[PDB]
A paper describes a structure:
In this TRC, nsP3 has been for a long time the least understood nsP, but recent studies revealed some of its functions in viral replication. nsP3 is organised into three domains: a macro domain (MD) at the N-terminal, a zinc-binding domain (ZBD) and a C-terminal hypervariable region (HVR). Macro domains can recognize ADP-ribose (ADPr), poly-ADP-ribose (PAR) in their free or protein-bound form, or O-acetyl-ADP-ribose (OAADPr). In order to better understand this mechanism, we initiated a structure-based study of the Getah virus (GETV) macro domain, which shows a peculiar substitution for one of the most conserved residues in the catalytic loop, namely serine replacing a glycine in position 30. We produced the GETV macro domain for crystallographic studies, alone or in complex with ADP-ribose, and documented several conformations adopted by ADP-ribose in the binding site.
Author numbering: 1 to 159
């Protein structure tokens, strides 16, 4: 069974075997988790473009980077975005299990740039749990907000 922890830290400083980038479909560097991943593992972005609701893995810069593209909730209906967000996390879980990845640092997809201005911490976290429950990986969830950290810890504890 997987284990879940939360850290309030820059995800570029993670101590796991792999890191999930909250990516865009075009594989461009812009504000958010992506900028931190690009600074620490710059060559991880080569050929990283992948459609919304999918993930694409690369080994670069001594790191396994998994580019996962959550939906932009400004560009889909709520129900369409919920389906696509579930799909992005399942694509992450499939890459973790098929590549024997033992531990992974994960940000909450679609909770920042792609949130459509809504609080989606619980929506994103519930899809993260449902998908990564299919793996045996140690999962470390990364956030920057003290209230998010507590919410996430509370949700981990309830389990
Ligand atoms: N360094 C950091 N360490 C830990 N947590 C971090 C972080 N930088 C941002 N976060 C948080 O990670 C979540 C995803 O944000 P993001 O805004 O990065 O994630 P999405 O909402 O999925 O949007 C993706 C787009 O930003 C896309 O264009 C990419 O270029 C960018 O990622 C948000 O809750 C952010 O507050």
């Amino acid at each position: 069974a997987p284990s879940y922890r939360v850290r309030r830290a820059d995800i570029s400083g993670h101590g796991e075997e792999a890191v999930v980038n909250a990516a865009n479909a075009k594989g461009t560097v812009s504000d958010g988790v992506c900028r931190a991943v690009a600074k620490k593992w710059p060559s991880s972005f080569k050929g990283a473009a992948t459609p919304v609701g999918t993930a694409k893995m690369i080994r670069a810069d001594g790191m396994t980077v998994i580019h996962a593209v959550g939906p932009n909730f400004s560009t889909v209906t709520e129900a369409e975005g919920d389906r696509e967000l579930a799909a992005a996390y399942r694509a992450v879980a499939s890459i973790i299990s098929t590549n024997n990845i033992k531990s992974v640092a994960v940000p909450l997809l679609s909770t920042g740039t792609f949130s459509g201005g809504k609080d989606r911490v619980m929506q994103s976290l519930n899809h993260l749990f449902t998908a990564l429950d299919a793996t045996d990986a140690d999962v470390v969830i990364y956030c920057r907000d003290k209230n998010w950290e507590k919410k996430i810890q509370e949700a981990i504890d309830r389990r």
